[PDB]
Amino acid sequence: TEQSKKQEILDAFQFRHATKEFDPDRKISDEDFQFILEAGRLSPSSVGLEPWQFVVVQNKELREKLRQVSWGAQGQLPTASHFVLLLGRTAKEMRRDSGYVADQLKHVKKMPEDIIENMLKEDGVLESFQDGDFHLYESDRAMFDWVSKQTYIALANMMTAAALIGIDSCPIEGFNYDKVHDILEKEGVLEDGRFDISVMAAFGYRVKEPRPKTRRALDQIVKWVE
Amino acid sequence: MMTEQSKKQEILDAFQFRHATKEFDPDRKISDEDFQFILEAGRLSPSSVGLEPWQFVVVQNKELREKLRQVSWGAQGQLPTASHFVLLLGRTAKEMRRDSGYVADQLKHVKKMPEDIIENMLKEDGVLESFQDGDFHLYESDRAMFDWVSKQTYIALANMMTAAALIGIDSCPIEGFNYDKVHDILEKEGVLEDGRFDISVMAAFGYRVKEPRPKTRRALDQIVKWVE
Ligand SMILES: Cc1cc2nc3c(=O)[nH]c(=O)nc-3n(C[C@H](O)[C@H](O)[C@H](O)COP(=O)(O)O)c2cc1C
Ligand SMILES: Cc1cc2nc3c(=O)[nH]c(=O)nc-3n(C[C@H](O)[C@H](O)[C@H](O)COP(=O)(O)O)c2cc1C
Ligand SMILES: NC(=O)c1cc(N2CC2)c([N+](=O)[O-])cc1[N+](=O)[O-]
Numbered sequence: 201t202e203q204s205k206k207q208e209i210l211d212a213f214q215f216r217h218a219t220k221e222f223d224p225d226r227k228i229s230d231e232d233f234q235f236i237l238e239a240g241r242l243s244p245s246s247v248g249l250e251p252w253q254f255v256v257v258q259n260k261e262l263r264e265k266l267r268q269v270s271w272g273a274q275g276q277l278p279t280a281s282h283f284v285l286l287l288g289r290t291a292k293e294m295r296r297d298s299g300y301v302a303d304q305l306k307h308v309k310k311m312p313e314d315i316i317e318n319m320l321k322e323d324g325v326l327e328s329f330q331d332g333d334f335h336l337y338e339s340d341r342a343m344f345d346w347v348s349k350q351t352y353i354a355l356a357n358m359m360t361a362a363a364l365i366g367i368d369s370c371p372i373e374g375f376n377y378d379k380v381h382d383i384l385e386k387e388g389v390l391e392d393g394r395f396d397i398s399v400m401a402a403f404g405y406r407v408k409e410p411r412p413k414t415r416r417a418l419d420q421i422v423k424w425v426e
Numbered sequence: 427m428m429t430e431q432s433k434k435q436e437i438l439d440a441f442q443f444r445h446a447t448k449e450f451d452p453d454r455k456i457s458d459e460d461f462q463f464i465l466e467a468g469r470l471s472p473s474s475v476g477l478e479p480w481q482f483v484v485v486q487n488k489e490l491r492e493k494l495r496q497v498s499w500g501a502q503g504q505l506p507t508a509s510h511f512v513l514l515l516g517r518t519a520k521e522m523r524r525d526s527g528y529v530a531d532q533l534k535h536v537k538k539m540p541e542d543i544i545e546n547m548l549k550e551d552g553v554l555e556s557f558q559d560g561d562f563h564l565y566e567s568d569r570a571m572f573d574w575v576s577k578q579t580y581i582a583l584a585n586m587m588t589a590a591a592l593i594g595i596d597s598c599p600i601e602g603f604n605y606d607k608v609h610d611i612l613e614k615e616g617v618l619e620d621g622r623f624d625i626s627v628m629a630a631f632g633y634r635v636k637e638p639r640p641k642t643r644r645a646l647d648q649i650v651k652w653v654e
């Protein structure tokens with residue numbers, strides 16, 4: 201039944217909540233966590249450039265360094281079965297003349313040469329969109345925030361995938377950007393400036409049943425223009 | 427054991443089913459129930475501070491679709507043929523501050539945040555301002571604040587597409603549009619509600635007409651790193 205299918209999926213959306221603390225002795229199995237990451241990997245990205253890395257931070261020392269500067273993750277970092285930093289490619293990786301773009305489109309996407317150079321010429325498709333349409337050249341931040349929006353697609357899907365098999369999660373922005381950037385830079389995670397932190401994500405099994413879910417009414421958030 | 431591994435396969439199949447659909451079947455329409463389920467996936471999406479700073483605008487009007495089409499080089503095929511077209515709007519910067527009414531009413535009446543919490547949350551140099559200004563540098567400009575809001579709308583966009591694909595419905599996320607012209611069109615149309623909203627990203631839904639090329643993604647060991 202497609203109606204029972206829809207109910208099941210909506211049950212997962214209700215099940216998923218912002219888990220603040222997980223069961224410290226229950227670990228997501230490796231197959232299950234690979235399924236979660238694959239939901240991330242299969243995510244769509246603007247221009248198909250996949251401007252992200254998923255860093256699985258199981259090392260306890262590093263978790264604790266992050267906990268110290270992440271006032272939104274106080275419960276999640278120590279107790280998560282798996283903890284993920286979602287990195288975005290940095291602004292220098294994303295221009296028409298960046299190696300990463302060129303390699304991504306040629307060797308991953310198998311874009312034919314004639315298409316590539318239409319895409320990456322001066323005032324090509326990529327620049328016409330990045331600069332003219334979306335103003336991503338105004339600052340490195342503007343470029344990176346656009347990258348980071350891509351990463352939130354991967355974040356939702358990983359969270360939704362987990363919930364659909366009954367695994368809890370919590371998206372996490374509650375960190376000091378400067379201090380986290382510095383921590384990861386020093387440790388080599390940002391890879392000589394190819395990456396920067398976008399958002400974090402914890403996964404595991406709930407300890408308590410959550411309070412009921414609250415959302416604005418469909419009537420408030422949906423406008424139709426017939 | 428094998429049944430759970432099969433449920434995971436069903437899910438992955440939906441993620442493989444979903445693709446950037448360039449053109450839809452203009453006769454096959456998404457049922458009203460099914461599209462309301464898609465929208466529910468958006469509504470139920472998580473958001474920073476649970477502020478749900480979005481509005482979903484379903485643009486079925488042919489005239490408006492075509493006005494948008496004239497300025498959206500990425501949507502040439504999708505806009506005329508989509509069963510449903512959605513503009514994801516984000517709240518603007520002045521809506522998102524600790525003493526904005528949108529924020530105050532959202533947390534007080536939708537989230538039902540109790541009084542001592544909401545006081546710590548919205549007070550000066552309270553939790554919200556310390557996060558917005560100290561941690562994420564969102565006071566630096568209206569765009570920084572809006573792009574943060576806009577990131578949240580991409581959670582709702584992702585869940586809408588995945589939900590659609592789980593029941594066999596195609597989608598296409600769309601950034602290929604001129605912000606300025608699209609902004610002005612939506613202003614003149616009154617869609618942005620006197621500057622409370624601005625355009626974030628758009629999404630088309632419907633039924634494919636062509637089968638897609640094989641999906642390509644970077645290798646798992648290219649996009650995943652473990653720090654054990
Ligand atoms: C991008 C993002 C960042 C978030 N940051 C945090 C965080 O740092 N710590 C936390 O406990 N919850 C965080 N949340 C959880 C929200 O408060 C929560 O999703 C919202 O209140 C809705 O409740 P629900 O997720 O249970 O439906 C975040 C949510 C999102 C989408
Ligand atoms: C945020 C976003 C915006 C996009 N913009 C457009 C667009 O304007 N027009 C279009 O045809 N495709 C667009 N795409 C589709 C991407 O090219 C596509 O998702 C990517 O190449 C991966 O291919 P797949 O989704 O077919 O797996 C967009 C995708 C995302 C995530
Ligand atoms: N009109 C286009 O050629 C276009 C534009 C965009 N958006 C970036 C401007 C995207 N895309 O976002 O994936 C993809 C395409 N494309 O068809 O490969």
Ligand SMILES: NC(=O)c1cc(N2CC2)c([N+](=O)[O-])cc1[N+](=O)[O-]
Pocket residue numbers: 271272273372373374375473474475476553557
């Ligand atoms: N440390 C917190 O109190 C905190 C921080 C954040 N992030 C914004 C800083 C979020 N949240 O993002 O939802 C939620 C909370 N919270 O527990 O209600």
